[PDB]
Amino acid sequence: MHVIKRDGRQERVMFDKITSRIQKLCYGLNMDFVDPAQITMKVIQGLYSGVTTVELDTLAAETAATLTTKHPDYAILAARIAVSNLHKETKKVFSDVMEDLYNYINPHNGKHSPMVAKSTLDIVLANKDRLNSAIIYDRDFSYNYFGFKTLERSYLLKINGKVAERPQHMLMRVSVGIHKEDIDAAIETYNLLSERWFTHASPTLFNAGTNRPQLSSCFLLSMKDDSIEGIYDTLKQCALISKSAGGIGVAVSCIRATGSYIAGTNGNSNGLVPMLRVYNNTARYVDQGGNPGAFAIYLEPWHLDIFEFLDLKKNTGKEEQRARDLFFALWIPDLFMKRVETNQDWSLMCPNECPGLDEVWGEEFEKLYASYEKQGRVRKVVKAQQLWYAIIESQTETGTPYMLYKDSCNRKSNQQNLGTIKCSNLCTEIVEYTSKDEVAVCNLASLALNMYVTSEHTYDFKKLAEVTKVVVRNLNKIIDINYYPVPEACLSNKRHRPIGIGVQGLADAFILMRYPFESAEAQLLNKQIFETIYYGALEASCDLAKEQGPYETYEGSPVSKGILQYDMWNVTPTDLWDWKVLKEKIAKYGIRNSLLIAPMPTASTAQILGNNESIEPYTSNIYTRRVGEFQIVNPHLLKDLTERGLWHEEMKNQIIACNGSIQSIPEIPDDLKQLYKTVWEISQKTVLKMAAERGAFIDQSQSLNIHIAEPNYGKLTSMHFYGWKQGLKTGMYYLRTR
C-alpha cells in the first residue's frame, strides 16, 4: 500500500510513521488514555492505495474524533491533526494572506473583488514586521475538532473554495479591523482572542477589516405609525437590514386591530395577520440570496389581535393565517399578570381607539388603560386566564412566544430617560430604545468564564475585570467603524452608544470549581462573576468618558443620578468590589455607554471555544455534534470517570439509556452525580432565581431558555409567575421539552 505525498511522490504506508506523526501532536495530552497507535489502527483498516496524505490526514482526524467517547483529549488531537494539515495547505505569513485576499479576482466575472479593505491592508503593510511576528501559530492547536470544523466552514476566508486563512490570521485581521493604527491595542486584542479569554460575535469575526464592515448584526425597530406608509417604510427598513444579515426585533402594537375603521377608505382593517404575512414573505425573500431573514415580532397582550397572533406559528393551520418564518414574542405589562392570578377580566383594545398604550409603562400604563376601560373604549373583554391559557397552549405546541416583562424592562433601564422601550431583539437579551428616528443596534461579545478558574480551584476576579475592560473598549471602537444598513441605526448607536457583553462556559466554570449548578457555592460564584463583569465594564466606560466625554443622552439617565443596575433591583452587592469608589469616579466623568451587559446565545462562538452555551447548564452528559454525526460525552465528566477507572463501553450505553443522565448509575459516587446533573434534573425555579440574582448586575437582559421535560399548564404557569415575581426582564426565551 502506498500514499501519495503532497509532492506527488509515492510512499509506503507504515504503522510506525503514521503513529509517529500523531505522537508529535500529543504535547500536554493525557497519554494514560490517549493512544496514537489506536488511531493508526482504525485508519489503516479502511485504506486503499492511491490515497493522498491530505486524505490520510482527514481520515485520521475524523477517526481521532470518534474516539472522543474514550477520552475528550482525542477531540483536541483530532483538531491538532486537521490544523497540522491546514498549516501545510496555507501560507505562513499574515501580511501575505492579506495581500492574497485583497488581490482576489473572481474567476467567472474577471472583476477585482478584494476580500479585505484597502485601508486594512495598508495598515498591515505599514506594520508588517511587528504584526507578522506577534502571531503564535501554536495557538491554532488549542481547539477541539468540532470547534475547528465550525471555524473551517464559515470563518476562515476562502480563496476559490480553498481555505487561505489560518485561525491566527483571522484573529489578527479582526484585531487590525477593530484597532487600525493602534498596533499596541491590536496586539493586545489578538493575544486575548487567540488565548481564548473572550470572543467577538460572529458578525465581527466575519467582517472585521473588510469593506463596508457589518460588525454588529442585531437590530430593533418600532412600527413607525399606523398607516400603509408607515408599515411599508418599516418593511423596507427590515428588508435592508436583512440584506446585511441583520436579525431583528419589531414592535407591532401600534397597528390597528382587525375590523377597525379606516376613515380614509371607508373600509375596515385586515389587522396584524395579513400584514405579518408580508413581513414573513419578506423574511423568506431577502435571505442574502439562495440561503431566511429572522424577524421577532413583539405584541402587547392588550391588543385585540392577540389570539390570532398566538396562532401564526402553529404548524397545523390554514397557510393564509400562518407566518411560520417569523418568531414571536410578548411584551407584557404587570397589569396582565396581576389580572391572571387574581382571575379578573382583561380588555382587548384597538390602538387606534386607545392610542399610546405602547408609549407608556408601569403606573402610567395602568392608569391610561384603566380610563380607556372606564370610558367603554374596549373591543372585547375575556377572562384574563383565557388569554393566559392561549399563551401556554402556544408554548406547548411551538415553544413560543418569548416572555418579556415590559415594566421590568423599562423600570430598570438606564435608557429610561429616552422614553418607553417598546421591544427586545431576536434573542430577547437586548432592551434598547426605538422610535421613528431610531433603530437600535446590538454590539456584542462574550467572555469565556471557564478561563478565569485557576489550578487551585479559585476564581480570578481581577483577570475577568481586566479582560472586560478591553472588551468594552473594542465594542466601543466597533460603534464607530460599523457600516450601518439604515441611517436610523447609525443615529441610535452614535447617540446612546449601547453595548452588550455576554458570557459562555458558565457551566464549565462551575464544574472546574467543582460546584453543582444548584449549590450555595455556585449561587454565590454566580453573583460574584456578574458583579465583576459589571464593575470592570463601568470602569472602562468611565475611563473612555474621561478621555472622550459621555454619550449624548447621558444627562438625565439613572447612572447620571448615581443609580446603577442593582439599585434598580434593590440589591446590595457583596463585599467583593468597592462600588462607592466606582460611583465616585462615575460622578466625575460619566460613562461612554448607556448600556453594557447582555448575555446572548452563543450558539456558534461557544462551539468554537469548546464551552457550553451562555449561562446554561449542560443539557445532557452525552450529546451529538453534526459535521457525519459525532457522539460526544461531557468532557469534564469523562475525565472524572476515566481518572477513577470507571469508564467502559456499557457505561456509555447506560447513560444513553438514561437520556444523558448519570443519576441512577450505582458505580458513580454521589458528589459526581450532583456535579453532572442535566438541565432536565435541575430546578427551573433555581435557574430563574440564579438569573435574577445575576440580573441585578445586567443593565440589559438575558436569553433564558427554560427546560421542562413533560409540561402541563400548572408547570408552565408556576414557572412563568415565579420568573415574573423574581423581577426578570426576559422570563423565557425558548421553552424546551422532550
Query: CB under 5 to 8 A by kind: which of ligand TTP, its own copies, Mg ion, none does 256 bind?
Result: ligand TTP
Annotated catalytic residue within 144, 410, 425, 612: 425
Q: Which residue has the cell 421539552?
A: 737
Residue 264 assigned ligand-binding role: yes
Query: CB under 5 to 8 A by kind: which of its own copies, ligand TTP, Mg ion, none does 142 bind?
Result: none
Residue 640 assigned ligand-binding role: no
The Cα 478–Cα 433 span in angstroms is 20
The Cα 98–Cα 95 span in angstroms is 5
Is-contact 222 399, C-beta < 8 A?
Answer: no
The Cα 682–Cα 719 span in angstroms is 13
CB of 260 to its own copies, least distance (A): 9
The Cα 621–Cα 655 span in angstroms is 8
The Cα 80–Cα 557 span in angstroms is 50
CB of 606 to ligand TTP, least distance (A): 27
Does 427 qualify as catalytic in the annotation?
A: yes
Nearer to Mg ion, 227 or 553 (CB): 227
Query: CB under 5 to 8 A by kind: which of Mg ion, ligand TTP, its own copies, none does 662 bind?
Result: none
Does 450 qualify as catalytic in the annotation?
A: no
User: Which of 113, 93, 110 is CA-nearest to residue 164?
Assistant: 93
Does 429 qualify as catalytic in the annotation?
A: yes
- CA 576 to each of CA 524, 527, 528, 529, 531: distance values in angstroms, whole numbers, following the listed order: 11, 10, 7, 10, 8
CB of 553 to Mg ion, least distance (A): 30
Nearer to Mg ion, 228 or 581 (CB): 228
Residues near its own copies, by CB under 8 A = 108-109, 113, 212, 228-229, 231-233, 235-236, 239-240, 243, 245, 259, 261-270, 274-275, 277-278, 281-282, 284-290
Residue 53 assigned ligand-binding role: yes
Amino acid at site 693:
E
Annotated catalytic residue within 254, 350, 423, 427: 427
| DSSP category for residue 256 | P
Nearer to ligand TTP, 85 or 280 (CB): 280
Residue numbers after which the chain breaks, C to N beyond 2.5 angstroms:
291, 627
Nearer to ligand TTP, 271 or 500 (CB): 271
Nearer to Mg ion, 230 or 362 (CB): 230
Residues near ligand TTP, by CB under 6 A = 226-228, 231, 243, 255-256, 262-265, 269-270, 286-289
3-state secondary structure of 100: helix
CA angle 44, 47, 51 (to 5 degrees): 120
Of residues 507-566, those binding Mg ion (CB under 5 A): none
Binding range to Mg ion, per CB under 5 A, among 153-161, 221-229, 351-359, 571-579:
221-229
CA angle 323, 326, 331 (to 5 degrees): 110
The Cα 260–Cα 48 span in angstroms is 73
Query: CB under 5 to 8 A by kind: which of ligand TTP, its own copies, Mg ion, none does 113 bind?
Result: its own copies
- What's phi and psi for 544, nearest 5 deg? -65, -30
Told to check if 270 binds Mg ion by CB under 5 A, we report no
Total residues at interface with Mg ion (CB under 5 A): 1
Which DSSP string do the residues of 542-611 spell out, in sequence order? HHHHHHH---TT-TTSTGGGT--HHHHTT----TTS-HHHHHHHHHHH--S-S--B-----HHHHHHHT-
CB of 227 to Mg ion, least distance (A): 4
The Cα 490–Cα 487 span in angstroms is 5
CB of 240 to Mg ion, least distance (A): 11
CB of 226 to ligand TTP, least distance (A): 4
The Cα 184–Cα 179 span in angstroms is 9
| DSSP category for residue 638 | H
Residue 602 assigned ligand-binding role: yes
CB of 297 to its own copies, least distance (A): 15
Annotated binding site for dTTP: which residue ranges? 226-228, 243, 256, 263-264
Annotated binding site: which residue ranges? 5-6, 11-17, 53, 57, 202, 217, 226-228, 243, 256, 263-264, 425, 429, 602-605
Residues catalogued as catalytic: 425, 427, 429
Annotated binding site for GDP: which residue ranges? 202, 217, 425, 429, 602-605
Annotated binding site for ATP: which residue ranges? 5-6, 11-17, 53, 57
Q: Which residues bind Mg ion (CB under 5 A)?
A: 227
